[PDB]
Amino acid sequence: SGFRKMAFPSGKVEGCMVQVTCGTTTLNGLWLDDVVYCPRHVICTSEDMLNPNYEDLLIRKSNHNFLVQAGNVQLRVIGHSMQNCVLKLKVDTANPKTPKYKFVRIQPGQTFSVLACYNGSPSGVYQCAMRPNFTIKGSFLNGSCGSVGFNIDYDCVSFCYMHHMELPTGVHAGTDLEGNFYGPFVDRQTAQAAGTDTTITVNVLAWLYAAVINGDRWFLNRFTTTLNDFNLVAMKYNYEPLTQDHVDILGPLSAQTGIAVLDMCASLKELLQNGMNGRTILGSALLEDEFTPFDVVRQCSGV
Amino acid sequence: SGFRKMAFPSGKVEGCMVQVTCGTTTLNGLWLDDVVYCPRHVICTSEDMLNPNYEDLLIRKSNHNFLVQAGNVQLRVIGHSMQNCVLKLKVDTANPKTPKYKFVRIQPGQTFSVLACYNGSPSGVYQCAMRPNFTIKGSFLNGSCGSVGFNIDYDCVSFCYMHHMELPTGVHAGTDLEGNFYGPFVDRQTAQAAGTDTTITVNVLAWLYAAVINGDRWFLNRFTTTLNDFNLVAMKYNYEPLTQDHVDILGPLSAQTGIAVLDMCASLKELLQNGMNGRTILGSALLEDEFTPFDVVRQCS
Numbered sequence: 001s002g003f004r005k006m007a008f009p010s011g012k013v014e015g016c017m018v019q020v021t022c023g024t025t026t027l028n029g030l031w032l033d034d035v036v037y038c039p040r041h042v043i044c045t046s047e048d049m050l051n052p053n054y055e056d057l058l059i060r061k062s063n064h065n066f067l068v069q070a071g072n073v074q075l076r077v078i079g080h081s082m083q084n085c086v087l088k089l090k091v092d093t094a095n096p097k098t099p100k101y102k103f104v105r106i107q108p109g110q111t112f113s114v115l116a117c118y119n120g121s122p123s124g125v126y127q128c129a130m131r132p133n134f135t136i137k138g139s140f141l142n143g144s145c146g147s148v149g150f151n152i153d154y155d156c157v158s159f160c161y162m163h164h165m166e167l168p169t170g171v172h173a174g175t176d177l178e179g180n181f182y183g184p185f186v187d188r189q190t191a192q193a194a195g196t197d198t199t200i201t202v203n204v205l206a207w208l209y210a211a212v213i214n215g216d217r218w219f220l221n222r223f224t225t226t227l228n229d230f231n232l233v234a235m236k237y238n239y240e241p242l243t244q245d246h247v248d249i250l251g252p253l254s255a256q257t258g259i260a261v262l263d264m265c266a267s268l269k270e271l272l273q274n275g276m277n278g279r280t281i282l283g284s285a286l287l288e289d290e291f292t293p294f295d296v297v298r299q300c301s302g303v
Numbered sequence: 304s305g306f307r308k309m310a311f312p313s314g315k316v317e318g319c320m321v322q323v324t325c326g327t328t329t330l331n332g333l334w335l336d337d338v339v340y341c342p343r344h345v346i347c348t349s350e351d352m353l354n355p356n357y358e359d360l361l362i363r364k365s366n367h368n369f370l371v372q373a374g375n376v377q378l379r380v381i382g383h384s385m386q387n388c389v390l391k392l393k394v395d396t397a398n399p400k401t402p403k404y405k406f407v408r409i410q411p412g413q414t415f416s417v418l419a420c421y422n423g424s425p426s427g428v429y430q431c432a433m434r435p436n437f438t439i440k441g442s443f444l445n446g447s448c449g450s451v452g453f454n455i456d457y458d459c460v461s462f463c464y465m466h467h468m469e470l471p472t473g474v475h476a477g478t479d480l481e482g483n484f485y486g487p488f489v490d491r492q493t494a495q496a497a498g499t500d501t502t503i504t505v506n507v508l509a510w511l512y513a514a515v516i517n518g519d520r521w522f523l524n525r526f527t528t529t530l531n532d533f534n535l536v537a538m539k540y541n542y543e544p545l546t547q548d549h550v551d552i553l554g555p556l557s558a559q560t561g562i563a564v565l566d567m568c569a570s571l572k573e574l575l576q577n578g579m580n581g582r583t584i585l586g587s588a589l590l591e592d593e594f595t596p597f598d599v600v601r602q603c604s
């Protein structure tokens with residue numbers, strides 16, 4: 001029993017974190033085989049930041065402009081190139097701790113684990129969702145750039161996020177590991193705002209199932225609804241639309257539970273229209289939207 | 304900026320997790336140097352749970368009755384002893400991944416990370432606190448016994464919790480790594496009510512300081528309070544008493560923010576009285592009590 005915001009075990013990623021310094025800029029790199037990946041803004045000075053020409057900034061640098069430290073040892077940089085917003089530094093020695101891995105780009109509403117790092121050294125791990133507005137509500141300080149987010153499947157690390165910047169509102173923006181930004185953001189110090197965020201409906205449903213699985217079921221009711229009817233309510237409360245795909249995804253949770261997805265939508269509809277106020281769910285006074293259906297299955301099944 | 308329930312990176316502990324089986328009973332062990340630590344109730348059958356005599360059950364076992372599996376490898380048990388409610392299995396190979404470590408017994412209100420495991424393999428990691436009633440509010444299923452809680456201030460792992468059992472209320476009980484239970488509990492399937500679960504007041508204060516550090520002050524007010532008057536009020540909400548030790552401990556956060564500890568106590572008294580009125584603090588609609596003063600300074604600056 002119990003339900004907590006749970007991160008993947010981070011051991012396989014901790015072995016890949018290094019420090020990357022170019023001039024006076026220092027941040028984290030991800031060392032896999034003989035390449036270190038990090039944000040391309042490492043090659044910026046404070047003033048470059050305001051309007052960088054990354055082509056020209058990198059044309060001016062050579063391999064010896066980059067210091068890469070794996071804890072105590074120095075990795076000799078023997079090559080460099082940019083892929084989109086990520087710098088790739090070829091080093092002279094392959095990481096003996098490289099895990100089975102692949103680079104994957106996630107959709108908004110998917111969750112992942114963040115290994116927050118400073119000076120190449122892991123300092124904490126926590127669980128995040130890619131918001132519908134493509135930001136993530138992380139916990140990052142200066143020096144955290146290059147920290148990565150990931151999921152684990154069996155024995156394969158799927159890297160999905162690299163940290164690049166904090167927006168003025170205090171939320172965070174980054175890329176996949178091929179350097180493609182999530183969201184309409186640019187790696188430049190210039191005014192930019194995320195769109196208005198929404199609530200990840202399918203994840204709220206998942207968490208309500210987690211509540212039922214844990215014996216918390218005061219919010220169930222005799223009613224059902226239609227996808228079409230529910231989405232009228234959802235749109236009005238800034239909830240993401242619920243799709244037939246979402247219904248299917250929730251299948252195994254409805255099985256594991258005995259509550260049909262459109263039945264649970266009827267409970268969520270009432271929670272939106274009337275609140276809960278008096279009561280809590282799974283120890284929360286808010287409707288939690290950073291657990292996916294699979295998150296719930298894996299935590300409640302012991303995967 | 305931002306503020307999350309952050310756990311320590313679990314790699315150093317993952318490399319210590321093994322599976323221990325005795326008869327039909329299987330759980331996790333912690334493999335440090337040439338010893339595997341696990342809950343002694345691994346030697347119980349379903350029929351032994353109501354009134355186990357562990358000394359009698361253990362004397363009937365030989366080393367080869369304990370099957371220890373590290374990944375794909377079977378570790379050979381060459382000896383065994385019982386220390387309080389933990390079993391120590393000596394094995395013939397020391398763990399090459401053993402981190403720098405120590406055992407520490409923690410106090411109520413302290414936080415730690417949990418690496419939840421099944422069959423010696425990690426499921427996930429999350430952050431917990433030792434409740435005032437000496438339970439923890441974990442996320443644990445059958446087979447999770449032997450999972451451990453830890454901190455890693457610097458590069459040394461401090462093991463502070465081993466998971467033993469789930470109470471009928473759905474909260475969890477276990478031991479330090481010397482096998483002494485936290486709280487009055489016993490590794491036996493008998494009734495054992497946990498005390499009232501009160502709120503960790505000093506942690507709630509640290510967390511309000513976290514909110515100020517991160518730029519939010521809406522909940523402060525113009526009042527102060529005596530410590531005595533604060534405690535008289537707060538205990539009516541089942542908040543733990545705040546001691547002068549807690550007040551001293553909050554000194555550093557008080558200094559960074561410019562908010563006297565008893566002025567933040569006044570704000571807390573008013574939050575209990577008023578609730579949030581539709582607002583949130585650090586993304587929560589409830590007052591959060593599983594961040595310590597030490598956690599806040601670690602995460603915020």
Ligand SMILES: Cc1ccccc1COc1cc(Cl)cc(-c2cc(-c3c[nH]c(=O)[nH]c3=O)cn(-c3cccnc3)c2=O)c1
Pocket residue numbers: 024025026027041049140141142143144145164165166167168172186187188189190191192304
């Ligand atoms: C987006 C926006 C809009 C208006 C005004 C300002 C902005 C912000 O604009 C940028 C652009 C870029 Cl390209 C990078 C950054 C950035 C750099 C650094 C950094 C620099 N120098 C080091 O040596 N190490 C480092 O980590 C760190 N953080 C950071 C800080 C805290 C949490 N999370 C991340 C950055 O956000 C910021």
Ligand SMILES: Cc1ccccc1COc1cc(Cl)cc(-c2cc(-c3c[nH]c(=O)[nH]c3=O)cn(-c3cccnc3)c2=O)c1
Pocket residue numbers: 001327328329330344352443444445446447448467468469470471489490491492493494495
């Ligand atoms: C305390 C109390 C009071 C009144 C009624 C019941 C109770 C509970 O009484 C005990 C006593 C003991 Cl000594 C152990 C357990 C227990 C065993 C097992 C277990 C067994 N058999 C395996 O093969 N592997 C295993 O992990 C697993 N869980 C467990 C289950 C879920 C989460 N967390 C832990 C136990 O709580 C239970």
